[PDB]
Swiss-Prot record:
Changing residue 330 to C: In BCHED; results in 20% of activity compared to wild-type. The keyword Nucleus does not apply. It comes from the Eukaryota. N-glycosylated. No other PTM detected. The major N-glycan structures are of the complex diantennary type with 1 and 2 N-acetylneuraminic acid molecules (Neu5Ac) making up approximately 33% and 47% of the total N-glycans, respectively. Only low amounts of fucosylated diantennary N-glycans are detected (approximately 2%). Triantennary N-glycans with or without fucose amount to approximately 13%, whereas 5% of the total N-glycans are of the oligomannosidic or hybrid type. Changing residue 291 to M: Does not affect enzymatic activity. Substrate binds at residues 113-114. It comes from Homo sapiens. Changing residue 9 to R: Does not affect enzymatic activity. This is Cholinesterase. InterPro entries: AB_hydrolase_fold (IPR029058), AChE-related_enzymes (IPR050654), AChE_tetra (IPR014788), CarbesteraseB (IPR002018), Carboxylesterase_B_AS (IPR019826), Carboxylesterase_B_CS (IPR019819), Cholinesterase (IPR000997). The active site is at 195 (acyl-ester intermediate), 322 (charge relay system), 435 (charge relay system). Tacrine binds at residues 79, 435. Changing residue 87 to D: In BCHED; the mutant undergoes rapid degradation. The gene is BCHE.
Amino acid sequence: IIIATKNGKVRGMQLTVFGGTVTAFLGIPYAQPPLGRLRFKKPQSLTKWSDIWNATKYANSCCQNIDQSFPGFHGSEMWNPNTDLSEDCLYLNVWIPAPKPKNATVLIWIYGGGFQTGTSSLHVYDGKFLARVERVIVVSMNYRVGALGFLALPGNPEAPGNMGLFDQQLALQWVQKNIAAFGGNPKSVTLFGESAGAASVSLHLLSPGSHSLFTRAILQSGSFNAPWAVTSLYEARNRTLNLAKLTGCSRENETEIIKCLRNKDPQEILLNEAFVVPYGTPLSVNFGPTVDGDFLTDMPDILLELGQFKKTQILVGVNKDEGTAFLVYGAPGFSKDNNSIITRKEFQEGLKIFFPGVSEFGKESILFHYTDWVDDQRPENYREALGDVVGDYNFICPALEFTKKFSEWGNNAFFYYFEHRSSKLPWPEWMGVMHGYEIEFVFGLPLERRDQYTKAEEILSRSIVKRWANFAKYGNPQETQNQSTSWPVFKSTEQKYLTLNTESTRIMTKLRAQQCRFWTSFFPKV
Ligand SMILES: *[C@@H]1O[C@H](CO[C@@H]2O[C@@H](C)[C@@H](O)[C@@H](O)[C@@H]2O)[C@@H](O[C@@H]2O[C@H](CO)[C@@H](O)[C@H](O)[C@H]2NC(C)=O)[C@H](O)[C@H]1NC(C)=O
Ligand SMILES: *[C@@H]1O[C@H](CO[C@@H]2O[C@@H](C)[C@@H](O)[C@@H](O)[C@@H]2O)[C@@H](O[C@@H]2O[C@H](CO)[C@@H](O)[C@H](O)[C@H]2NC(C)=O)[C@H](O)[C@H]1NC(C)=O
Ligand SMILES: *[C@@H]1O[C@H](CO[C@@H]2O[C@@H](C)[C@@H](O)[C@@H](O)[C@@H]2O)[C@@H](O)[C@H](O)[C@H]1NC(C)=O
Ligand SMILES: *[C@@H]1O[C@H](CO[C@@H]2O[C@@H](C)[C@@H](O)[C@@H](O)[C@@H]2O)[C@@H](O)[C@H](O)[C@H]1NC(C)=O
Ligand SMILES: [O-]/[N+](=C\c1ccc2cccc(O)c2n1)Cc1ccccc1
Ligand SMILES: [O-]/[N+](=C\c1ccc2cccc(O)c2n1)Cc1ccccc1
Ligand SMILES: *[C@@H]1O[C@H](CO)[C@@H](O)[C@H](O)[C@H]1NC(C)=O
Ligand SMILES: *[C@@H]1O[C@H](CO)[C@@H](O)[C@H](O)[C@H]1NC(C)=O
Ligand SMILES: [Cl-]
Ligand SMILES: [Cl-]
Ligand SMILES: [Cl-]
């Protein structure tokens, strides 16, 4: 019940899972709270404590704006924070099997949310099932988001940028120094994350200072070469200054600006973040990772191109309908409460929404590539096209390209295509296999027979949980006992990937080949 860590004793709590027991340590601090003069700075190391820290409840989530578009709707509200917001939020969680393992592979989850939302306490991030079923230790951490976590005056230590990434890195360090006390193997640590979490993982592969803090990596629906994932130093400054103006904090001393933003209450900073950009999109990441020269020494697309990353195995994948969710946060004619049949006209307006600073030619080129129909009289033609445009540009093609480029340096890569729509999915059917709705399967929620999943979903989750754990433990995401499809390595020539569904698991080649040539070879010129 009580574990000695290098900063003090922490008391956990016991959980009944599937007629077994898991020990949960919820809300262990891993940094000095970034308050007062510490706001915007890199996380500071923790001063020891002499008591028994009671790590029995999730801690505060980090300050963040909340999605209020669909009040009372579980489909959107399941992602909103479920603990008090506070700047005091640098805490982490540990689930360890009972009885205490001896040298367990460690899984470290990094949540997504566009670098502006998210929290490790979400129901769908509960590591108790993975600990019970696979005897891995699961660790998750809160990290600062938004301007509080990514405001950047590059070079300036009062706000160097990438603080949220250093939050995560400091947590990986805590696991290196402390997880053997919990029965974990610090030499067998697999990072996994979804969306901005997955982009973060991919950046830890690139950041020299994280190379000794983990073994292997899993990237779900996200990678750093996604167009929303890195802010340029131009944008990052223009956005910092705009925030200064919106808060009456413009100064000439760049340091005095920060000093002024440090006296602002968190709500005022939060309220102004949306407007630092002239034209946002539903995919806007106004404050995110930048080339700071510390966590990131060069523009990441160059490091990836020239093999400057940790050499190891990766497991990468995407969902069938990553794009659809964003279409009801601003695309015209769209709604979660109807079939969202849209006209050609509405499709073109939608592109203006999703590609606001893109020229008329570029937008026409997106239209051209996605509107050569198999049947021009199918009315969902344009609704589906816009979802795929957003999905292919923002998630699927960057992840495939990351996997091609990373595998070209000799490392084993595994790619999956998740195409199961949860039987409990509260969004409408036209949105399909949405962004984020593989997470419950990865965490083994369908293993709980009491929670209204089909038996088919329990079998799919159980297989996915095995492949993930085998990947973490052995670098190979196979299910070796139940006559399962073998998951082949991804190679830049053949480009084989594994489809994950309840019906049949299949091996296919060259996912979204035509679409991604447009997005990765032509569209970056416009
Ligand atoms: C860089 O910043 C300027 C300033 O942004 C404006 O003011 C901020 C405080 C905030 O409220 C933003 O929403 C504002 O747009 C941007 O310049 C503006 O650009 C728009 C259209 O591009 C124009 O209509 C405004 O008049 C401009 N205002 C000023 C003061 O110049 C600029 O677009 C930003 N981005 C880039 C890439 O330079
Ligand atoms: C699907 O609904 C959208 C959204 O409209 C809102 O939500 C509906 C469920 C309903 O409660 C409406 O009263 C709401 O206004 C519709 O988009 C609207 O379309 C009308 C006419 O085309 C237009 O006046 C509005 O500006 C549109 N609102 C937008 C674009 O945000 C859409 O037409 C509906 N489509 C189908 C096929 O039913
Ligand atoms: C930390 O917890 C100690 C033991 O708490 C015991 O177990 C928990 C689960 C509760 O059921 C509680 O009622 C029990 O007493 C406390 O003795 C101690 O005071 C706590 N420390 C702080 C700082 O709150
Ligand atoms: C725990 O294991 C250490 C070696 O780790 C090995 O390599 C990593 C990459 C994983 O694949 C893991 O499964 C392997 O066991 C030992 O050096 C260490 O002494 C062990 N500690 C124990 C047994 O308490
Ligand atoms: O983008 N926003 C919401 C969003 C995006 C993607 C999703 C994918 C799956 C399910 C969802 O509920 C999703 N919700 C709005 C919003 C943006 C930034 C801060 C606060 C709020
Ligand atoms: O708000 N949520 C997601 C969100 C918001 C804004 C984004 C902007 C750019 C890129 C993104 O991936 C974004 N994702 C909720 C949510 C969290 C995790 C999984 C599913 C849904
Ligand atoms: C003002 O800027 C100078 C450098 O231009 C810096 O050394 C100084 O610390 C700033 N003022 C304060 C009060 O920190
Ligand atoms: C393998 O099949 C058995 C039933 O024959 C099932 O109980 C078990 O959960 C399966 N294991 C995996 C990893 O899917
Ligand atoms: Cl498809
Ligand atoms: Cl082929
Ligand atoms: Cl082309």
